[PDB]
Design a protein around this ligand. Structure first.
Ligand SMILES: Nc1ncnc2c1ncn2[C@@H]1O[C@H](COP(=O)(O)OP(=O)(O)O)[C@@H](O)[C@H]1O
Ligand SMILES: [Mg+2]
Ligand SMILES: [Mg+2]
Length: 214
């Protein structure tokens, strides 16, 4: 119900750095988000090894990429463990993350932005290509929620009464920058996935919309 939270100073600082950088290899955002999806799938698989009923909320383990061309949105969905409301608030903005200042110091020293994941803040690489993001998430322990950020110093968390039910897992909705619309294209997405996400334990599904003609 429109709960507003403030990003910690260090994350606000990181977001500003990333959204404005002219780094040349922006495509690594997709590697980082697929890695987060894979990690979340690892966690529900771990739980399911001891308690198989944890999968009943969504029996299939998958990563799914859904371009929304008309909206200029790229969706990245997983059926991983998901995040409760408290997880969203805690894990995506309010708690000091170990590595945030270290990564910013590495950047000042010449580090390549692709190293962002090694510092535990790979999620924020999405701001290389998007200026607005929604994170829709459903954990077995909670209702479905939407976390939302406009790249500023605040984010919101709201009970989800407007998006498709996930069953279980997380969907990132990336509102792409106007010069980054190549990541809506089937050919481009395939290229980036095959280059940077060759070794993933779960199927990576690409949803493509084609007209029926002739
Ligand atoms: N798809 C997802 N499903 C579940 N949790 C996620 C997802 N993406 C991000 N998270 C949460 O956000 C945190 C921050 O992610 P990130 O900045 O990439 O750092 P790291 O992956 O190194 O923890 C993760 O540790 C996790 O708790
Ligand atoms: Mg990560
Ligand atoms: Mg549970």
């Amino acid at each position: 119900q429109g709960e507003t939270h403030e990003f910690t100073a260090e994350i606000s600082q990181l977001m500003s750095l990333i959204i404005n950088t002219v780094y040349s290899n922006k495509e690594i955002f997709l590697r980082e988000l697929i890695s987060n999806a894979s990690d979340a799938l690892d966690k529900i698989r771990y739980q399911a090894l001891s308690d198989p009923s944890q999968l009943e909320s969504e029996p299939e383990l998958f990563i799914r990429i859904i371009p929304q061309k008309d909206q200029k949105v790229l969706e990245i969905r997983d059926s991983g463990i998901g995040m409760t409301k408290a997880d969203l608030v805690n894990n995506l903005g309010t708690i000091a993350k170990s590595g945030t200042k270290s990564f910013m110091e590495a950047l000042s020293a010449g580090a390549d932005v692709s190293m962002i994941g090694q510092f535990g803040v790979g999620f924020y690489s999405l701001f290389l290509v998007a200026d607005h993001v929604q994170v829709i998430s459903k954990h077995n322990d909670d209702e479905q929620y939407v976390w939302e950020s406009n790249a500023g110093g605040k984010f919101t968390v709201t009970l989800d009464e407007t998006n498709e039910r996930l069953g279980r897992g997380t969907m990132l909705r990336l509102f792409l920058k106007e010069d980054q619309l190549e990541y809506l294209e089937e050919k481009r997405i395939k290229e980036v996935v095959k280059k940077h996400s060759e070794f993933v334990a779960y199927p990576i599904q690409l949803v493509v919309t084609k007209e029926v003609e002739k």
